[PDB]
Amino acid sequence: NTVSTMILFGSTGDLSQRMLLPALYGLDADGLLADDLRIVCTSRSEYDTDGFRDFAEKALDRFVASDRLNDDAKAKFLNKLFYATVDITDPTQFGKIADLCGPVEKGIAIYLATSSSLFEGAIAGLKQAGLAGPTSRLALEKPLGQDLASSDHINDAVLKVFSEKQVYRIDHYLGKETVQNLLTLRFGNALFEPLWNSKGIDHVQISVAETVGLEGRIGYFDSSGSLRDMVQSHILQLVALVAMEPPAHMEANAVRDEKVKVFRALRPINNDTVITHTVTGQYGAGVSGGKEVAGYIDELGQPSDTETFVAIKAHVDNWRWHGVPFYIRTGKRLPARRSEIVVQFKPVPHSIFSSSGGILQPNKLRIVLQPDETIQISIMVKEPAHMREVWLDLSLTDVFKDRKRRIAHERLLLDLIEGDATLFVRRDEVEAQWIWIDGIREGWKANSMKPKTYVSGTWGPITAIALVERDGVTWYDLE
Amino acid sequence: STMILFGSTGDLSQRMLLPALYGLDLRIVCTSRSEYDTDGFRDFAEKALDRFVASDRLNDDAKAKFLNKLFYATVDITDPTQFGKIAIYLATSSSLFEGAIAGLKQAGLAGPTSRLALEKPLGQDLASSDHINDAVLKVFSEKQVYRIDHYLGKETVQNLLTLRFGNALFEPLWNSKGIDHVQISVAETVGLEGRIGYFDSSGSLRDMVQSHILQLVALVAMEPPAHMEANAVRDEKVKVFRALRPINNDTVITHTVTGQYGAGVSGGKEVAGYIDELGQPSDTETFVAIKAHVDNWRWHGVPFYIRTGKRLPARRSEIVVQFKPVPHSIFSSSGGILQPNKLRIVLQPDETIQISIMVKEPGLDRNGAHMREVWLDLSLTDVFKDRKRRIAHERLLLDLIEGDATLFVRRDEVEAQWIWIDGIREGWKANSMKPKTYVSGTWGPITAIALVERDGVTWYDLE
Amino acid sequence: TNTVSTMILFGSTGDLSQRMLLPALYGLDADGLLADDLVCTSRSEYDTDGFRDFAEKALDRFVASDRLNDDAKAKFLNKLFYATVDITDPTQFGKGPVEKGIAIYLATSSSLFEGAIAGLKQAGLAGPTSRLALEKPLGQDLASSDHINDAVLKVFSEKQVYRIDHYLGKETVQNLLTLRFGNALFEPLWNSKGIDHVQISVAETVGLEGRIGYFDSSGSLRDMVQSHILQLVALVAMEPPAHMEANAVRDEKVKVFRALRPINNDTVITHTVTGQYGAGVSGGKEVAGYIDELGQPSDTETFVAIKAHVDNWRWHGVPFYIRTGKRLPARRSEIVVQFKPVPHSIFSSSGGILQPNKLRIVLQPDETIQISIMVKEPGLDRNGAHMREVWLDLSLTDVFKDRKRRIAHERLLLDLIEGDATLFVRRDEVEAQWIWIDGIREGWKANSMKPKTYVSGTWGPITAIALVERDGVTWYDLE
Amino acid sequence: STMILFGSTGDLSQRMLLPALYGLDADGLLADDLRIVCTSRSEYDTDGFRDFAEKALDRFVASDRLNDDAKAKFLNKLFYATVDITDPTQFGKIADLCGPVEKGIAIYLATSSSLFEGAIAGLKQAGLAGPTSRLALEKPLGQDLASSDHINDAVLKVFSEKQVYRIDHYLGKETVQNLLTLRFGNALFEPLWNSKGIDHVQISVAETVGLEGRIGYFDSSGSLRDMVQSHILQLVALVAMEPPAHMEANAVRDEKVKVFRALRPINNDTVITHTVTGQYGAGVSGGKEVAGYIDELGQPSDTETFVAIKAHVDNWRWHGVPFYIRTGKRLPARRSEIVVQFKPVPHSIFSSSGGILQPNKLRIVLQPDETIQISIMVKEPGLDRNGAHMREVWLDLSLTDVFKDRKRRIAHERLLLDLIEGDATLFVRRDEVEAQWIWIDGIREGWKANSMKPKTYVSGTWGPITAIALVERDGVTWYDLE
Ligand SMILES: NC(=O)c1ccc[n+]([C@@H]2O[C@H](COP(=O)(O)O)[C@@H](O)[C@H]2O)c1
Numbered sequence A: 001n002t003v004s005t006m007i008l009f010g011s012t013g014d015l016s017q018r019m020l021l022p023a024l025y026g027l028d029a030d031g032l033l034a035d036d037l038r039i040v041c042t043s044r045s046e047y048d049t050d051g052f053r054d055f056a057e058k059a060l061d062r063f064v065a066s067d068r069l070n071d072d073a074k075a076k077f078l079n080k081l082f083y084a085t086v087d088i089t090d091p092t093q094f095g096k097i098a099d100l101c102g103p104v105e106k107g108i109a110i111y112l113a114t115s116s117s118l119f120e121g122a123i124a125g126l127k128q129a130g131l132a133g134p135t136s137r138l139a140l141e142k143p144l145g146q147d148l149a150s151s152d153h154i155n156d157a158v159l160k161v162f163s164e165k166q167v168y169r170i171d172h173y174l175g176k177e178t179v180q181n182l183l184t185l186r187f188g189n190a191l192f193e194p195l196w197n198s199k200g201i202d203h204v205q206i207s208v209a210e211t212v213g214l215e216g217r218i219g220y221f222d223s224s225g226s227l228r229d230m231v232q233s234h235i236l237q238l239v240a241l242v243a244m245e246p247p248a249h250m251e252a253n254a255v256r257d258e259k260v261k262v263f264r265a266l267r268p269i270n271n272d273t274v275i276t277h278t279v280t281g282q283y284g285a286g287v288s289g290g291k292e293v294a295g296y297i298d299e300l301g302q303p304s305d306t307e308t309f310v311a312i313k314a315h316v317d318n319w320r321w322h323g324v325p326f327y328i329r330t331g332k333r334l335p336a337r338r339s340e341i342v343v344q345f346k347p348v349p350h351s352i353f354s355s356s357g358g359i360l361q362p363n364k365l366r367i368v369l370q371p372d373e374t375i376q377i378s379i380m381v382k383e384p385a386h387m388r389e390v391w392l393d394l395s396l397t398d399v400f401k402d403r404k405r406r407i408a409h410e411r412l413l414l415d416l417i418e419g420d421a422t423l424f425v426r427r428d429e430v431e432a433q434w435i436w437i438d439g440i441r442e443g444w445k446a447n448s449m450k451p452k453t454y455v456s457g458t459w460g461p462i463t464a465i466a467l468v469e470r471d472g473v474t475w476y477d478l479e
Numbered sequence B: 001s002t003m004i005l006f007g008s009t010g011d012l013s014q015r016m017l018l019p020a021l022y023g024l025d026l027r028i029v030c031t032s033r034s035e036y037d038t039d040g041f042r043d044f045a046e047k048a049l050d051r052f053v054a055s056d057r058l059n060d061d062a063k064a065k066f067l068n069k070l071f072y073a074t075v076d077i078t079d080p081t082q083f084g085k086i087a088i089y090l091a092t093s094s095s096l097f098e099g100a101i102a103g104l105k106q107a108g109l110a111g112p113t114s115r116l117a118l119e120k121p122l123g124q125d126l127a128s129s130d131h132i133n134d135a136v137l138k139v140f141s142e143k144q145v146y147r148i149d150h151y152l153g154k155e156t157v158q159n160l161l162t163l164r165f166g167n168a169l170f171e172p173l174w175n176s177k178g179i180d181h182v183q184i185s186v187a188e189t190v191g192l193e194g195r196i197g198y199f200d201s202s203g204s205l206r207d208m209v210q211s212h213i214l215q216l217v218a219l220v221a222m223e224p225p226a227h228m229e230a231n232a233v234r235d236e237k238v239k240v241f242r243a244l245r246p247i248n249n250d251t252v253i254t255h256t257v258t259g260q261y262g263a264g265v266s267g268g269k270e271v272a273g274y275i276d277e278l279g280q281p282s283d284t285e286t287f288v289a290i291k292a293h294v295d296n297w298r299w300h301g302v303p304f305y306i307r308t309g310k311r312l313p314a315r316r317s318e319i320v321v322q323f324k325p326v327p328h329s330i331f332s333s334s335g336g337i338l339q340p341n342k343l344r345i346v347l348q349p350d351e352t353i354q355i356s357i358m359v360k361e362p363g364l365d366r367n368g369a370h371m372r373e374v375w376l377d378l379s380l381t382d383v384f385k386d387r388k389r390r391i392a393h394e395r396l397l398l399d400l401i402e403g404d405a406t407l408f409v410r411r412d413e414v415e416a417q418w419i420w421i422d423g424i425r426e427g428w429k430a431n432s433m434k435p436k437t438y439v440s441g442t443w444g445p446i447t448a449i450a451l452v453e454r455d456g457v458t459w460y461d462l463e
Numbered sequence C: 001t002n003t004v005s006t007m008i009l010f011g012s013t014g015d016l017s018q019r020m021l022l023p024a025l026y027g028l029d030a031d032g033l034l035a036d037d038l039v040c041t042s043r044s045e046y047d048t049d050g051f052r053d054f055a056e057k058a059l060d061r062f063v064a065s066d067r068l069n070d071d072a073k074a075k076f077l078n079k080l081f082y083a084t085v086d087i088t089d090p091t092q093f094g095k096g097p098v099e100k101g102i103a104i105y106l107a108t109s110s111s112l113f114e115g116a117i118a119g120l121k122q123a124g125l126a127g128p129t130s131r132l133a134l135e136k137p138l139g140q141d142l143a144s145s146d147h148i149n150d151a152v153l154k155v156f157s158e159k160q161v162y163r164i165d166h167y168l169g170k171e172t173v174q175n176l177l178t179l180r181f182g183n184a185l186f187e188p189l190w191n192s193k194g195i196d197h198v199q200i201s202v203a204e205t206v207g208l209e210g211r212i213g214y215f216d217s218s219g220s221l222r223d224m225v226q227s228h229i230l231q232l233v234a235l236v237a238m239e240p241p242a243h244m245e246a247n248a249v250r251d252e253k254v255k256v257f258r259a260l261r262p263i264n265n266d267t268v269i270t271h272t273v274t275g276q277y278g279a280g281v282s283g284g285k286e287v288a289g290y291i292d293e294l295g296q297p298s299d300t301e302t303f304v305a306i307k308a309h310v311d312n313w314r315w316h317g318v319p320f321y322i323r324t325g326k327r328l329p330a331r332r333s334e335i336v337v338q339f340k341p342v343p344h345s346i347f348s349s350s351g352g353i354l355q356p357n358k359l360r361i362v363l364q365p366d367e368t369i370q371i372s373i374m375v376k377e378p379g380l381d382r383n384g385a386h387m388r389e390v391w392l393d394l395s396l397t398d399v400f401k402d403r404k405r406r407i408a409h410e411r412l413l414l415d416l417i418e419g420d421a422t423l424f425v426r427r428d429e430v431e432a433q434w435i436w437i438d439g440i441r442e443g444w445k446a447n448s449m450k451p452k453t454y455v456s457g458t459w460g461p462i463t464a465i466a467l468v469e470r471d472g473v474t475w476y477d478l479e
Numbered sequence D: 001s002t003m004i005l006f007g008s009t010g011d012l013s014q015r016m017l018l019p020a021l022y023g024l025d026a027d028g029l030l031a032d033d034l035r036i037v038c039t040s041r042s043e044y045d046t047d048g049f050r051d052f053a054e055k056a057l058d059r060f061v062a063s064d065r066l067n068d069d070a071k072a073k074f075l076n077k078l079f080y081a082t083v084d085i086t087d088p089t090q091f092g093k094i095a096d097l098c099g100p101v102e103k104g105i106a107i108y109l110a111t112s113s114s115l116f117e118g119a120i121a122g123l124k125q126a127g128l129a130g131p132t133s134r135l136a137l138e139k140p141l142g143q144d145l146a147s148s149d150h151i152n153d154a155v156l157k158v159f160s161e162k163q164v165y166r167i168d169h170y171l172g173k174e175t176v177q178n179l180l181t182l183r184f185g186n187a188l189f190e191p192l193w194n195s196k197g198i199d200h201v202q203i204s205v206a207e208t209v210g211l212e213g214r215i216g217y218f219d220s221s222g223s224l225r226d227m228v229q230s231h232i233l234q235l236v237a238l239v240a241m242e243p244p245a246h247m248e249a250n251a252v253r254d255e256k257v258k259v260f261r262a263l264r265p266i267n268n269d270t271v272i273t274h275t276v277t278g279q280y281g282a283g284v285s286g287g288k289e290v291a292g293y294i295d296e297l298g299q300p301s302d303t304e305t306f307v308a309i310k311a312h313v314d315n316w317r318w319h320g321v322p323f324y325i326r327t328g329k330r331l332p333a334r335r336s337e338i339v340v341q342f343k344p345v346p347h348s349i350f351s352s353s354g355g356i357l358q359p360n361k362l363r364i365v366l367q368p369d370e371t372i373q374i375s376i377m378v379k380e381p382g383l384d385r386n387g388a389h390m391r392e393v394w395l396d397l398s399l400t401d402v403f404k405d406r407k408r409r410i411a412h413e414r415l416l417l418d419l420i421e422g423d424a425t426l427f428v429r430r431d432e433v434e435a436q437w438i439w440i441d442g443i444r445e446g447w448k449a450n451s452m453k454p455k456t457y458v459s460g461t462w463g464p465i466t467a468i469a470l471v472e473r474d475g476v477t478w479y480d481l482e
């Protein structure tokens, strides 16, 4: 089902230069593209197809890794680069894109790199062009909704023209190689699944932490907040991958179908539940990176009711996971850039050792998705009569230094060209994720909850550290 | 106080025990097959003191102290008058014990407050261990007896129960289900020097499987005690050995393979064959391998693959628990071996724990998407650069000083070992089975290589 | 939510509108479940006004005697209508309040179903106000089934469609999930570890007599395994729904349907068996063979037998033995989960049979759940003491004497007047059912498997007992 | 060979043992050569007291087993000499009474532990002791562990442990014997027999009667010493034991002793929380008005007749699983039974629906009937508007119905035959006894320092209100049919 005609919308955007064109050339330069591939890039600004190509070369030079860069391999990729100045608002403009496009039976992959308000106009023009017709796919990587209603608004109006199979919603997460091995680690190994239940598993937690701020995306970040921005998709995907029941086989939908279910089955957070289970944290002026950094209001310059931090004790309510607290924690201006997963297991049924002897420490498996990728499992070992909880450590980066550090889109981009792709979100996953997330905002918006701030680099609001510790567990911290 | 190390003037107590004993610092009495002087025993100790940890010997004023305080005394072990030339260890052998035990006690008196450590196989047939034990227990106290397994005291052997029972993840699969087979391997690069004749009567099997490994097996297969009591531990090991599937005269043909180290190379030098070194024809098995079966609710149908040898290509000690594979491969044929997870701990050669894991390879939606096996390492001897890599024997003497057997073999344990062992012997001897020569530095007879492979399993090689 | 006062009946002339549907409806109105204000169209044209006489003939001799009463019948007789029309002719179909919902029940054949849609749309009956139910044997091939389904879908929304399987209404079939997931003892055992094989048997003493002509089309495997027995497999293997939802439960069956090991053309010689009932004894009486009863020589199976495999985490490697049969020794539908034997016999072989535990759900004619345990016989023996297998028996027929509900159909039917539809199948379910069964038929046709004769009343072809025998498994029978 | 019944005048001998022996004679499991010599403390001195034994046969033995002709064959194997354990000098009369040493002598002390030691001293003078001689004892085996040990120590000093065959009446009943067959002869249970899958265990011996003619012996001990140190504690070991490798006497025991060694100490502190005591009180029993225990005693009474405990085995398998023991006299019904409540379903797929989904339960009634059954949830049949109904149900097995044919025989006949056989299979070991004794001695001390008072319950009532609350605080209840 590979597509030899693809159209790049929003080609004027930073993402297309920053994450799209470099990924493409990276696929080119290695030969994953059928050389009979058309790529009709479209932007409002005016450039000659040879012209646009020169702009792309700048982007390729300013973004593609130097080792990949080759003046021959760039040129071979540019001769598959064709552009066409078009207004969306005017559907009559699209026909010029249509003439460039390769025959429909070969098919068209339609990337949308714009704003969700701009989505509605563009789809209409394609049908007159004929690009709207089946044999056309469609990817989306935008603020395509903040609540259900918009997402339903945006999706319902799309599903009018295409179908779910045509739609390829994309999550930057799942591009990540580390995110992907997680299914392999759980289902390529038979030790984890026996204990991957409510019994022998005590608490689990997610922490996507970053020192960076909302530098540049502020004003636009102020609309999402950490919870709309990172946890809505990115983090709930981690939960799905870690809690999903296995599919019978590695199918796009069957994999999705289990994640969809995990999204569907979770403890809802209600009005009364939110004060107990939710924590907010804005950023105080603080020194981060050894350099003093300004508060959120400092940079924002305006009153703001957005988070930057979130931390939620979620519950998966399925036979397997019912009653296992899932402790989420994301935020900016944190002590380290370290996204990580810690599964903590229930302690041994009986400590047959002396009370004096080191208290047993529950076995825990830790995976850090970013920046370093490592997998470690806690154990107890008698010391050369005492013990130390010592770790069985492994670094993926050490394991495969040679493998190329491809970009997260290079991979995502091809799945879309190749055929049905499991790394792309579905409406069923999308509606459920809002279901949980939305209420949370409405319930705590209805509760006049206002974020408790911390000085930047403080590890977040004190109110947080107690959400976990009033149940008796601590957030994993390096020592 | 005053001890007696009968056979301290020997290899047993020149590197393994007495050289290690330097750390164990009372007047020290030591018997001697080569009966030298008081100062000379210290001088002989001083050469062994030279063969000790460089830092600990250099730091110790003990080497000066050893010259300062020393005891030597014609052992006269055979003589009823073997004594007078508090606790004595029998660094002697089973033969150098029975008469030795009878006479050493009589000259200085005996009864309680006297040591009783076999420090030996202390038996050939059951009757040997039986008779020899029986005459001891009727003359000592059961608490006084300290049968010694050089291994059990080794710290790496010890953390197993902490490993096994301090960790939730290992036990759910530790079953008949969830384990495909277990694998124990005692390797040495060395041949036999000066011990071949004693070894030749004993056999490799008797020297290591009966004492060094069977305990290891218990530690690996035993059901836990309610609490970590000396007898609570031992009572559950006894349960293991007594649940060992007997090797009949029929089970020996298919389930065992004998070997013998031939002539070859070891490292950068080349060594000669075994019998030629002996100078007399030997039918002793330098190398033996067993397909032991333990039958219990937990394990019935889990093969235990034994392997200890001499002049082996490399010396390594470790256990390979290979787990029963995933009930289903949720992936396509094209990507991933999906090789079974295994837990491996190096023991005597180095202390490390590693678990086999399978991780998806960095990949793009190419036609092939393989997942590679990866291991989680812990260097038990690299994280504890603070803890002294102190010898294993040194600690056991502390337990003797306590007078509580924290780790000494029990008769009800021991008698379980021979009954199984001797059934291999009486049996395969009744079938006229003979040892197979193997090149020095190779991996025993090729008859073994087929023992592992008729099941669909292979031994463990790092490469 | 039906707002429905109108019922549509097709195929009344069949031995189904009389034996099951007409008595079923008798209950729906004789206990206040049918509105007082609340049609009969014949696949075979019949003289009219016969039905008021016909129901008394057909019902009296079909409905339960205790249930039967002179009064209840008159109201039912009045409500009933009878127009003599032909499915082949659309104009006939046109010859019914709009406000009342029209619910269309199709008790004809799959081929006749398309015509009914053809006349309804044109007669004025098909309406958003119309809900249509369809018989279980719809289609002989996935493409034929997909053909009819696609046509109905344009005419009717999926919700209006109510795909019928009578097995899903049988009480013993319904509580199967309650048995499995309302009880924690069963689930730990329900895995590749702890289950040796599952064993299903729908047994029948009666060969088709009137229906042989229509049967010869659909093999015993098509008539029963496609719908009835294949649902049983879902209930006995389906992973738990997080919550019981009509679609999620159907969704999880679909997952089970899709995880069956493909019976190709190479796995048909080894994992399937066909049979045709020869001549023998039925009730001390001599009854004739298939080919005698039906003159045309035929390769049709009056008996089938499968060794199906579910290849997921839970079930990979657990054999599934399915044996629908005609002219068999008994009418006993019965699932027999046989569990893995003790990991070790800590008991001497001489005194121990140590037979494996078996969960036997008897679905008909008697409701009788039971479990088998081995218990020591009471005697004084110094050695080799004997141990005897014993059964813990239950009787849903004896325990629920008070509940007193006669038939599955009345619940399913009433449900269509209610519009619930949880029992009714879903399209995605249907199509995964066919593709698996279609392969088994194609492989035998490509592999030229021909039914073996079995004297009528002998469990089946000798070949079945050997399909189990090679694997050590036997066919459970009361001994 | 030759049997001796020390304690011959005992009511227990009259009902439990003399009927059992008749059954062995009737079935011809008893040698014609074998002769039984009985010494009774206070009555029926004449050898023709067989009539007194025959009286015992009538009021106790089953009619079908009873056979007028068969009695005489048995009674003319009965030889009685009046003897006093306290005076050794009269032990001789038991000797000079058949008892050829080569045939050998099987000695039964239906006497109390206090009388145990004295009887042994007479036998050694009589030449009864040492070779060719066995020895049986009884359930109490001493007031305390030191008390049992002092009597114990001298037994092994006199006969080799091979020859002591201590009797725990429960171990040997067929329903008690099957337990291990239940546990390890099937694969269904053990997946869940752990601290994951189980809510709690419940062992309960109930009795409609009080103590009559047993009161003087009874007020020395108490119900826990009477039917717990030996009986109910054996049952606990069988329920919680890790399986043996293969079914050998010591292989079974060595794990049972561990279950006893595993149990957590009640201690002085836990008794307010884990111990409930009762004193049988005047009321109804059997439909009859029966007298209160103190009034029957004729003296103040500190002994329970009822106890209820929250036992804890602290091993890998059972750590933290409460075991609710409850043995009583004048309880509403006679019925020994075990109820395993399995930990409830992990999550409910039909949580919205009304039905409770009660936790599964394995019920084994050892007495008075023999029965195993299983709690399962199954959907209630209904036509449902919206919402669903689920009713719990029982999978039935009446062992007696399954094997009615095989003769039903007294546990003692199995227990006694092994004695002549010289078999220790249903006979307790000293290590078994000490572990049971230390636990009991510690609860008794805890009761002593806290001065707990048996709390009076009515006759025919479910014990004291104190016991119901101890079960209630967990949420657990007591199984009561209906
Ligand atoms: N007893 C029955 O007649 C019965 C049973 C199961 C399915 N069906 C199917 O429903 C329809 C019934 O038509 P007849 O009543 O003419 O057989 C057909 O599609 C038939 O194959 C009938």
Ligand SMILES: NC(=O)c1ccc[n+]([C@@H]2O[C@H](COP(=O)(O)O)[C@@H](O)[C@H]2O)c1
Pocket (backbone or CB within 6 Å): D007, D009, D010, D011, D012, D013, D014, D016, D109, D110, D111, D112, D113, D138, D139, D140, D169, D214, D217
């Ligand atoms: N039913 C019983 O009498 C019974 C039950 C268990 C043990 N015992 C023991 O047997 C002897 C009974 O003697 P009495 O018949 O005088 O009660 C005592 O040692 C007693 O502890 C009696």
